[PDB]
Write a protein that holds these residues in place. Structure first.
Motif, PDB file in Angstrom:
ATOM      1  N   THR A 130      58.378  64.401  51.501  1.00 38.64           N
ATOM      2  CA  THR A 130      57.098  65.067  50.813  1.00 38.64           C
ATOM      3  C   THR A 130      56.073  63.896  50.711  1.00 38.64           C
ATOM      4  O   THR A 130      56.323  62.818  50.124  1.00 38.64           O
ATOM      5  N   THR A 131      54.879  64.446  50.962  1.00 37.91           N
ATOM      6  CA  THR A 131      53.526  63.450  50.958  1.00 37.91           C
ATOM      7  C   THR A 131      53.579  62.672  49.663  1.00 37.91           C
ATOM      8  O   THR A 131      53.584  63.312  48.639  1.00 37.91           O
ATOM      9  N   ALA A 132      53.687  61.256  49.701  1.00 40.48           N
ATOM     10  CA  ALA A 132      53.751  60.379  48.477  1.00 40.48           C
ATOM     11  C   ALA A 132      52.675  60.794  47.282  1.00 40.48           C
ATOM     12  O   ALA A 132      53.388  61.014  46.134  1.00 40.48           O
ATOM     13  N   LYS A 160      57.325  68.986  52.911  1.00 41.44           N
ATOM     14  CA  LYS A 160      56.263  67.946  53.314  1.00 41.44           C
ATOM     15  C   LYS A 160      55.003  68.031  52.526  1.00 41.44           C
ATOM     16  O   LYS A 160      54.506  66.844  52.349  1.00 41.44           O
ATOM     17  N   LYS A 161      54.626  69.164  51.904  1.00 39.71           N
ATOM     18  CA  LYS A 161      53.479  69.188  51.136  1.00 39.71           C
ATOM     19  C   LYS A 161      53.811  70.342  50.171  1.00 39.71           C
ATOM     20  O   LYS A 161      54.343  71.195  50.401  1.00 39.71           O
ATOM     21  N   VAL A 162      53.300  70.067  48.835  1.00 36.61           N
ATOM     22  CA  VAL A 162      53.370  70.929  47.587  1.00 36.61           C
ATOM     23  C   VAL A 162      52.033  70.936  47.248  1.00 36.61           C
ATOM     24  O   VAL A 162      51.318  69.901  47.418  1.00 36.61           O
ATOM     25  N   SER A 163      51.733  72.109  46.633  1.00 36.95           N
ATOM     26  CA  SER A 163      50.348  72.223  45.731  1.00 36.95           C
ATOM     27  C   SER A 163      50.366  71.584  44.483  1.00 36.95           C
ATOM     28  O   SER A 163      51.426  71.256  44.037  1.00 36.95           O
ATOM     29  N   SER A 164      49.344  71.406  43.922  1.00 29.89           N
ATOM     30  CA  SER A 164      48.988  70.594  42.888  1.00 29.89           C
ATOM     31  C   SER A 164      49.880  71.116  41.371  1.00 29.89           C
ATOM     32  O   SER A 164      50.299  70.153  40.855  1.00 29.89           O
ATOM     33  N   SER A 165      50.065  72.393  41.238  1.00 33.31           N
ATOM     34  CA  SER A 165      51.022  73.073  40.181  1.00 33.31           C
ATOM     35  C   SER A 165      52.383  72.317  40.442  1.00 33.31           C
ATOM     36  O   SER A 165      52.855  71.972  39.388  1.00 33.31           O
ATOM     37  N   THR A 185      53.338  69.392  41.938  1.00 31.41           N
ATOM     38  CA  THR A 185      53.164  68.074  41.749  1.00 31.41           C
ATOM     39  C   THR A 185      53.189  67.845  40.117  1.00 31.41           C
ATOM     40  O   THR A 185      53.613  66.740  39.807  1.00 31.41           O
ATOM     41  N   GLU A 186      52.608  68.514  39.575  1.00 36.77           N
ATOM     42  CA  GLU A 186      52.104  68.315  38.032  1.00 36.77           C
ATOM     43  C   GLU A 186      53.226  68.575  36.968  1.00 36.77           C
ATOM     44  O   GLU A 186      53.313  68.280  35.839  1.00 36.77           O
ATOM     45  N   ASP A 187      54.221  69.441  37.747  1.00 33.19           N
ATOM     46  CA  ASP A 187      55.429  69.700  36.824  1.00 33.19           C
ATOM     47  C   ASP A 187      56.511  68.900  37.305  1.00 33.19           C
ATOM     48  O   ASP A 187      57.394  68.970  38.363  1.00 33.19           O
ATOM     49  N   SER A 188      56.797  67.650  36.577  1.00 34.97           N
ATOM     50  CA  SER A 188      57.855  66.556  36.916  1.00 34.97           C
ATOM     51  C   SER A 188      59.030  67.033  36.701  1.00 34.97           C
ATOM     52  O   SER A 188      59.965  66.305  37.425  1.00 34.97           O
TER      53      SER A 188
END
Length: 330
Positions: free
Chosen positions: A48-50, A110-115, A117-120
């Protein structure tokens, strides 16, 4: 075989539930959102994109002795809320609550949308809709449930979500201690790939029950209950000061309100959602406007019996040759 795993709300609003899942050898435990409205098992990973990882636990296939690249396979998914993810695919051993599947497709983001990323708290999704919705190309892959089915004592899983409390996902058996009364089964259409069924009607509070067919999906990955605008207006008309806000994006109500219950029909049976389950709290921190848990489906194209509804019931997802849904009170 059977499996049994506890599912835990990610926050004080029950926005979603996470269930630990063991992937690989030695086990890597990731907390996944079990989603009866999708069919991909995908995870945050070492790929996943760091900049898109913010506190999630990642799957690292290179540390699993049982991981194998599913050569050439990719995946890409978009959800009802506008979130998305994509990547490549490994096969690995996956266990849930003691139930093990070998050769499960584990879709590595590899990619995820902002929602995402923002949900740890959410390390990925485990889809439990029909495998016809799985996005892996060029070879579609099976869900964990479809892969486990033949090994299970009974071809079923059950969802027993808690209100502000943990609950349980069981595979392969129906815990007769987990519900009251009887289970009422209802037909399922698999035509759209979902656990799609028809409710027999609704009541608002202590009001009379309205007999009316409401087609919708049983979707553990959706927080709220999305119903036709007629039904939703009838509900919120019973709450002084409730209104639909285009600025907020749905029905809001005064935080001082006491909400009525909402009943939905399953055949001749009735599931009652207590009013407190419909309170999703202040729209913004400290606001005296609160967000409603019953919203209109008119801008979706489908009615969604999400967590607000499903947490009021013991729900049986019967994956026999003729699938059915069961609902019991609890």
């Amino acid at each position: 075989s059977t499996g049994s795993a506890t599912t835990t709300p990610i926050d004080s609003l029950d926005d979603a539930y996470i269930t630990p899942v063991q992937i690989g050898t030695p086990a890597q435990t990731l907390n996944l959102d079990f989603d009866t409205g999708s069919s991909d098992l995908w995870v945050f990973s070492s790929e996943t994109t760091a900049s898109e990882v913010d506190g999630q636990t990642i799957y690292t296939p290179s540390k699993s002795t049982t991981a194998k690249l599913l050569s050439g396979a990719t995946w890409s998914i978009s959800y009802g809320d506008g979130s998305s993810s994509s990547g490549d695919v490994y096969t690995d051993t996956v266990s849930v609550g003691g139930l093990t599947v070998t050769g499960q497709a584990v879709e590595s983001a590899k990619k995820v949308s902002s929602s995402f990323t923002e949900d740890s708290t959410i390390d990925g999704l485990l889809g439990l809709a029909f495998s016809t919705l799985n996005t892996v190309s060029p070879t579609q892959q099976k869900t964990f449930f479809d892969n486990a089915k033949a090994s299970l004592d009974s071809p079923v899983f059950t969802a027993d979500l808690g209100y502000h409390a943990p609950g349980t996902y069981n595979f392969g058996f129906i815990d007769t201690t987990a519900y009251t009364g009887s289970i009422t089964y209802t037909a399922v259409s698999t035509k759209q790939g979902f656990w799609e069924w028809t409710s027999t009607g609704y009541a608002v509070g202590s009001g009379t029950f309205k007999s009316t067919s409401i087609d919708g999906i049983a979707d553990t990955g959706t927080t709220l209950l999305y119903l036709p605008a007629t039904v939703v207006s009838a509900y919120w008309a019973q709450v002084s000061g409730a209104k639909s806000s285009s600025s907020v994006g749905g029905y809001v109500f005064p935080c001082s309100a006491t909400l009525p219950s909402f009943t939905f029909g399953v055949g001749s049976a009735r599931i009652v959602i207590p009013g407190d389950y419909i309170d999703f709290g202040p729209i913004s921190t400290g606001s005296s406007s609160c967000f409603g848990g019953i919203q209109s489906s008119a801008g979706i194209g489908i009615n969604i019996f999400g967590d607000v509804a499903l947490k009021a019931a013991f729900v049986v997802f019967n994956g026999a040759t003729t699938p059915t849904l069961g609902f019991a009170s609890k």
